């Protein structure tokens, strides 16, 4: 429902985009569990069509051919092993549920699928489910191309085909039931909740009808009254017919205005300044905090022409991406999702990356394992932003401050700002083109604190910058606009 169902005191999830199940299981044990991560959003676990032109794009995973748990990430036994191993170290699994459609209406008939199931897209045949012609919306679409021609018409957005994908007749109980049996199988395996893909393309009541069929979570890992966490992917930046509020009664909704506006402010575009973030959250017109799933970027818009366009910050803009993710993880608004990506061979032509369809690192189509090096970074083209010290330590900061109110805001009237969370954490940012040198009230008890952005508290010492907070809570902050990271963060568990 609205509660994430993470283990108590864990406050973020990470999207391990296109990772294989065996690698995620290992990552839960060696890293996510010990480092306090709440959970992992996984790529669609159900069987999809194989796209050979272009060669195995990441987007083929959003074109279902059955609900069998067999993909390039692994098979059902590997998926079950991952969910168990992660739940056992306190890390939940959330599934990307692709339920609005099946594969492209133009895909060829046959067994060119990730588990070898047969399908005949042209004749609306999906025997592995099973689905047939009457289970799709072709008869409802009022457009001439069969596609969505105007986003100011909710009926075409919900009933017509999204980029040529066969649109499921979600008002039918048979269809609502096939989808629920799939989600309930995942709940039985131990999943904690779901990202409902392409929610704007479904009627609010049809999604609720499917949700009404879901069981409570598995009692080997969750208390008996527990409803699955639901976050609906609705892209609503304003100025269109469909609003994110239409879905609030079903569960949380992705707040895409968050990353779009934060990226514009952090880049200092369109006259925006960091000092304007004093009233960040509902004051900027966003949805209620208790209904929001927030993030700086996602797998679609980190490619540059998604929701937010070029203002979206990504790992390619690492210096500013870290400050945006750090501000997000320190601020109380919303439930936070961090991104973990792969690097692809970009190829710009006339200013555009024509290679943005490229799928995960692979050897002849088999996804590469995630290798871990000693500096704790990753190999094999995986970026592993969730392992960057500055992000890992801020997800720990958000756990440490859980519940504490936004407090002690300061700004220099331009792009230097700071704020705390009750008496448990404080963060300071310098996004101006000059030195930050200020005495600030931190709200924290006096002591010597390790800055968790530049280092870590190890034993009774700090490996980075030390911040000396006096008994009245004040501390001297000095941050160069050219520092490795132009922000500092300290909290109760970083005190010596």
């Amino acid at each position, epitope marked *: 429902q609205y509660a994430p169902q993470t283990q108590s005191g864990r406050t973020s999830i990470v999207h391990l985009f296109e990772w294989r199940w065996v690698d995620i299981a290992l990552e839960c044990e060696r890293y996510l569990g010990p480092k306090g991560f709440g959970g992992v959003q996984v790529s669609p676990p159900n069987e999809n069509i194989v796209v050979t032109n272009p060669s195995r794009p990441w987007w083929e995973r959003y074109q279902p051919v059955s609900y069998k748990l067999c993909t390039r990430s692994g098979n059902e036994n590997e998926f079950r092993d991952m969910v168990t191993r992660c739940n056992n170290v306190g890390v939940r699994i959330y599934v990307d549920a692709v339920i609005n459609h099946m594969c492209g209406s133009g895909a060829a008939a046959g067994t060119g699928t990730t588990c070898g199931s047969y399908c005949n897209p042209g004749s609306r045949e999906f025997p592995a489910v099973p689905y047939s012609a009457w289970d799709f919306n072709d008869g*409802k679409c009022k457009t001439a191309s069969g596609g969505i021609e105007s986003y100011n*018409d*909710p*009926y075409q957005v*919900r*009933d017509c085909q999204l980029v040529g994908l066969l649109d499921l007749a979600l*008002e039918k109980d048979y269809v609502r039931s096939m989808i629920a049996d799939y989600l309930n199988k995942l709940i039985d395996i131990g999943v904690a909740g779901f990202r409902i893909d392409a929610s704007k393309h479904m*009627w*609010p*009541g*049809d999604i*609720k009808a499917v949700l009404d069929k879901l069981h409570n979570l598995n009692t080997n890992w969750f208390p008996a009254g527990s409803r699955p966490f639901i976050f609906q992917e609705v892209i609503d930046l304003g100025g269109e*017919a469909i*609003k994110s*509020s*239409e879905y*609030f*009664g*079903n569960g949380r909704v992705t707040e895409f205005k968050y990353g779009a506006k934060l990226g514009t402010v952090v880049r200092k575009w369109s006259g925006e300044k960091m000092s304007y973030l004093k009233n960040w959250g*509902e004051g900027w*017109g966003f*949805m*209620p*905090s*208790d*209904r929001a799933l927030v993030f700086v970027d996602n797998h679609d818009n980190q490619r540059g022409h998604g929701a937010g366009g070029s203002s979206i910050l990504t790992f390619w803009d690492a210096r500013l991406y870290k400050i945006a993710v750090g501000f997000m993880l320190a601020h109380p608004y919303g439930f936070t999702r961090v991104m973990s990506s792969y690097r692809w061979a970009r190829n710009f032509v006339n200013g555009e990356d024509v290679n943005d369809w490229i799928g995960p690192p692979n050897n002849n189509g088999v996804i590469k394992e995630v290798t871990i090096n000693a500096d704790t970074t990753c190999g094999n083209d995986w970026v592993c932003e969730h392992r960057w010290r500055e992000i890992r330590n801020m997800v720990w900061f958000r756990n440490v401050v859980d519940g504490q109110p936004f407090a002690n805001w300061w700004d220099n009237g331009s792009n230097q700002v700071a704020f705390g969370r009750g008496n448990r954490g404080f963060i300071v940012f310098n996004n101006d083109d000059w030195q930050l040198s200020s005495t600030l009230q931190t709200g924290l008890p006096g002591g010597t604190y390790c800055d968790v952005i530049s280092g870590d508290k190890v034993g009774n010492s700090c490996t980075g910058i030390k911040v000396y907070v006096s008994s009245d809570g004040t501390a001297q902050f000095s941050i160069s606009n050219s520092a490795e990271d132009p922000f500092i963060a300290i909290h109760a568990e970083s005190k010596l």
Partner: nanobody
Amino acid sequence: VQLVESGGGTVPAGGSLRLSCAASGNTLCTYDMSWYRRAPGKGRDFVSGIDNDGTTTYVDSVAGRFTISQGNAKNTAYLQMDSLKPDDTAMYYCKPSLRYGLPGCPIIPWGQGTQVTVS
């Protein structure tokens, strides 16, 4: 189907008002209801909503002071606003959202709203 909004007025801080919203004329249609408000110079922001199953959502600034409920009949809702503060002053708009698509159930556009002035 027509959108009918009512209840606006001027009360002093601490007073109450109750807004009403109805999307009547075709009982086969089902509309979920959500109120937004626009103060001069601010944007039109969500404040409270309720779906057909009675599930409520409130923005934090009105929690415990505003109560949204299903009205007299299907496709009707009320927004009981108590302990009004001067910052609650704004033009309020009910936006009915179609819950299920059906032949001849229209999408309803923003209406004119109602004016609420506190103090």
